[model samples]
Target chain A: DYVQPQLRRPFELLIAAAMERNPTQFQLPNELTCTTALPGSS
Target chain B: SNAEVKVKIPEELKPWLVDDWDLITRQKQLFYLPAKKNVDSILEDYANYRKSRGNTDNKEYAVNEVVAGIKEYFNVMLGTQLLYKFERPQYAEILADHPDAPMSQVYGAPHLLRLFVRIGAMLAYTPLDEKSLALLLNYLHDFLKYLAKNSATLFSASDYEVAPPEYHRKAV
Candidate 1:
C-alpha cells in the first residue's frame, strides 16, 4: 500500500543518510521497468 | 611452492562451529548489534588478506579466511563458557540449569580476546610481560563472570524491570 515510487538513489538522498549498517544493494529491475542502471558516473 | 600461511583455529574450538554457530552469532546480535566500526575493520582486514603470498591474490581463499576468522572469534568466546575454572559468587545461584550460561559473557570475552590477539601480534615492537598479561586476564575474569550471571537480564530487560516482562516469567 504505497507509491511515491520514491526511494526510487542514492533517487532520494538523505543528508548523512543515516548510513545503513547493511543497506539494500539498490538496483534497477532486471528488465529495466521503472529504473535505470548506471554507476558512480560508471 | 607458494602456500598461504593459514590462520588455524585451535582444535578445541571447532566443536562450536559444528554446533549452532549461527545461533551463537544470532544471540550475540541482540546485545551487540554489528556496527560500522566493527564491520569496516573486517572489510579492511579481508582486503589486507588479499596480499596472501608469493605475489598472487585469490579472492576465493580471501573469503574463506575471513569466514574462518569470524568463526574462530565466536568459538573462542564459547570457550570461556565451555571450560570451567573458578567458582562463582553468590549471584550465580540462579543459573544451575543453564550450563552454557557462561555464554552470557560472550560479548565482552571476544572483544577482550581480540585485544589479546592484537596485543600478542604487537609484541614484536611492544614488549609485554607474562605476569602483567596474567593480571589483566585476572581483572577481566570476575568481570566476565559477573556478565555471565547478569547478561541474561540485559537481553531480556525483564529481569531488571520491576514489572518483569512476560518473557522473564520463566524464572531461571
Candidate 2:
C-alpha cells in the first residue's frame, strides 16, 4: 500500500517521508527541478 | 504561462470531493521536528482575493472547478501505486525485459504524461501512440478503484509538525 496513505494527503508523506534516508541510497542525480525537500541531503 | 484558463471539472471528476482530505491527517502532531507556518494566512489571502473580486455569482462553482484539478493531480499522479511503480519502474516486472532500460527516459515519460492526465489534458491532444502508455492510461480507472482497499507503506522514521505563527491570522 505504498500509495494508499497518501490518498489522504501528500504533505503527510513528505513530512514523514523517512526522506532523509534516501540521499545515500537513491543517489539522486543532480537534476532537481527546484530543490528543497529531497532524500539525499544532510 | 500557457494562457492558463479555469475550466469546469468534467463529469469524469466531479464526485471525488466526497473525499477532500485523502484522509492523511492524524489530528495530532507525532514528531518534534518543526516547520511552522500560519497556513491560516494562506487561505486568508486567497480567500480574500476571491472576496475582493466581488463577482461572487459563480463563486463556489468557480473555486470548485479549479480546486478539483488540484486534488486530482495529487491523487492520481503522485499518490497512485500504479503510477508510482511506473515512475519507479525498477521494482516492476520490466526487471529483465529490458535490463538495459535507461532510467531517465522511462522516468520522464510518466512525469510529463501524468501532469497532462490529471489536468484533464491529452498529449498531442490525441491518444498516445505507444501501446504501453495507452495500456497504462487504461489501468487508471481500475487502479483508482483498486487502490483504496489497501494499506500503504509509511516512512515511519521520519516526521514533522507545522505550527502557526504566534500572531497567526491577526485581524487585517
Candidate 3:
C-alpha cells in the first residue's frame, strides 16, 4: 500500500530548491529559522 | 525580536494541515489562486463550526486562545513564512501597486495554510506552555480537517498569473 506524503513540511520540500538557487548557501530567514535538517543533509 | 523559546511538532500531525504536492502544485509552481473566503472569514467560519459542535467551558477557552494565536500567526508571518519563493515578487508587486492593500484581508486559505508549514519553527520563539501547546495542536488538527473537506471550494485555479521568463533569469 502506498502512503500519502505530508505537504505541511515545506522546509524539507523546498530545501533542494533553496540550495539550487544558492549553491553557496541555503538557510531559513533569521526570523523564520528552524533547527530541522533534511534527511540526507547530515 | 524574542528568539529563545522552542517548540516541537510531532511528524504525524503535519498531514492534517495541507494537501499532497500533486493536488495543489501546478505547472511546477506553488502559487495560491484566489479563494471563496479569505483567511479572516474562514477563521470565523471555523469558530462557528466549533461553536456548533458545543464546546465545554474549558474547550471554549482553548478555542478562543488558539484562534487568537492563529490570527496573530497569519498576520505576522505573511511576509516571512506564508510566501513561496516564486510568490515573493508577486507579493511585493501587490504591495507596490496597492500601497495600502490589507494583505491579511486579501489572502485566503491557500496562503493561510502556508503559515502552518513554518509555524512550528516560528512558534518556537512564541513561548507557549505545554498545556497551551497541546490545545493549539488539537485546534490545528481540527482546522486542517475542515480545510481538507472543503479544499475544492476553498482554493481556486482560475486567472492565475505566471511571472515572465525574465523574472527567473539569474544575473548575467
Clashing pairs in 3: none
Candidate 1 vs candidate 2, TM-score winner = 2
Residue B100 deviation, candidate 3, in Å?
Answer: 1.7
Give stretches of model 3 more than 4 Å off. A1-42, B1-36, B55-60, B156-162, B166-172
Ranking by DockQ: 3, 2, 1
CA-based DockQ, model 3: 0.04
Candidates ranked, most accurate by TM-score first: 3, 2, 1
Candidate 2 stretches greater than 4 Å from native:
A1-42, B1-48, B55-57, B79-172
Best by TM-score: 3
Model 1 chain B scores worst on lDDT over the 10 consecutive residues at B82-91
Task: List, for all models, the DockQ compared with the true complex.
Answer: 0.01, 0.04, 0.04
Ranking by lDDT: 3, 1, 2
TM-scores for every predicted model: 0.21, 0.22, 0.61
Model 1 lDDT per residue over B1-172, tens place: 1222112223332232222222222232122222222423433443464455326654444344333433343333333322211112111332444446433232333333232322222223322244433433342343334334443342232212232234223222
* Candidate 3 structure quality by residue, lDDT tens digits, B25-119: 32433344343578878878888798787755335555655566566556655665465545655566667777886666667776777666555
For residues B31-83, what per-residue lDDT tens digits would candidate 2 score against the true structure?
33121322222223333555565664434443333234333333333323213
